[PDB]
Design a protein around this ligand. Structure first.
Ligand SMILES: N[C@H](CCC(=O)N[C@@H](CS)C(=O)NCC(=O)O)C(=O)O
Ligand SMILES: N[C@H](CCC(=O)N[C@@H](CS)C(=O)NCC(=O)O)C(=O)O
Lengths: 206, 206
């Protein structure tokens, strides 16, 4: 039977939406998790010297969004029509831009860089999310479904719900001014197979 | 009949691989270009207040890679199999990461940022491309086709060839230590429909 392996750090980070695609699909996989200490010696194993990396029957696929889209297309979470799949991609790409914007914050919370999460949250994340959540609000207005694109859950939903809920665990004011984005996280995370995964996944700081 | 519009600045930049997909496909489109000056009055029309943005029969799709993939799937430049398509995505996502890395350099040459382009080329671009072209070289070694993934052009190839060609016009030392990357740009840009587009496209600074 097909074998999937996901390799990433011992954390949610860029791998988490991929783990949630597997959960929604009811698809078993090997969840390989590295400490920051163990990781470096495995760098040369990976297509771009980075993680996450998926293996399917021993074939490697790098890049978290390439991996998310590949599995979402296979399992029914990519969008309902070719144009909708593209709309899903555009939202995911806007999310990726936002994450790039807040990278200094994420590196600090992950323990990778030294810093004050609270200060970065206020100075960096709040203004970045004001712009970002503003566009997400627009997509939700258009959909009228509670999901970002179309009438059913996609990997773009998983990315957003995971991010916002993850930050809100530490800094709940992320949702201030944006009750729609809170509603979205709680809608997505209550999908039964996801709710079960969230109940049982390792507790990690990032 | 289907109608496409592409809106971007008066330049190659993020829109150019998309223009090249249309050229390869033999597909007519409305090519709309704004100078830096003319853009602000149009910002709020756009899904994320950024360009490029595609319209297909009046439906907007933003985000350059989402646009490129959508058109590539439609026209035969996305990859031949679902796994190859994902591999193509992964290369394009590494490309995007590289472009992010050299953003400070790009912004100076486009004139958006103030700086020393020669200094940034040597201190930022050369070390970034050494890592990135290293991975691209391994991909070309695997394909044995002259293309990054599989045996025919994909939008990933267009991205790389447009980038390296475009830099090389000013700083041809980008190809130093990477003859295979120069060969790749030459191969891609020699494809007939593309060669013709390159011959006729507006001459722009970026
Ligand atoms: N475009 C990114 C690149 C992945 C990335 O920045 N990888 C990090 C994981 S959060 C990593 O490998 N960190 C350790 C290292 O770069 O050596 C993606 O979405 O996968
Ligand atoms: N993730 C990018 C973002 C698009 C972007 O940075 N667009 C620039 C043009 S290169 C822009 O609209 N700049 C003008 C502005 O933001 O007002 C993409 O691939 O499309």
């Amino acid at each position: 039977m097909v074998h999937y392996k996901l390799t990433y750090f011992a954390g949610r980070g860029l791998a988490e939406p991929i783990r949630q695609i597997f959960a929604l699909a009811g698809q078993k996989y090997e969840d390989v998790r590295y400490t920051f200490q163990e990781w470096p010696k495995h760098k040369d194993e990976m297509p771009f010297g980075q993680i996450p990396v998926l293996e399917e029957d021993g074939k490697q696929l790098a890049q978290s969004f390439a991996i998310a889209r590949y599995l979402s297309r296979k399992f029914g979470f990519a969008g309902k029509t070719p144009f909708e799949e593209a709309l899903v991609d555009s939202v995911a790409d806007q999310y990726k831009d936002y994450i790039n914007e807040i990278r200094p914050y994420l590196r600090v919370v992950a323990g990778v860089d030294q810093g004050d999460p609270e200060k970065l949250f206020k100075e960096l994340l709040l203004p970045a999310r004001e712009k970002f959540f503003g566009f997400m609000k627009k997509f939700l207005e258009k959909s009228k479904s509670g999901y970002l694109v179309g009438d059913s859950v996609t990997y773009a939903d998983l990315c957003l719900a995971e991010h916002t809920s993850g930050i809100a665990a530490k800094f709940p004011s992320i949702y201030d001014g944006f009750p729609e984005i809170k509603a979205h996280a709680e809608k997505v995370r209550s999908i039964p197979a996801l709710k079960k995964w969230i109940e049982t996944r390792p507790e990690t700081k990032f």
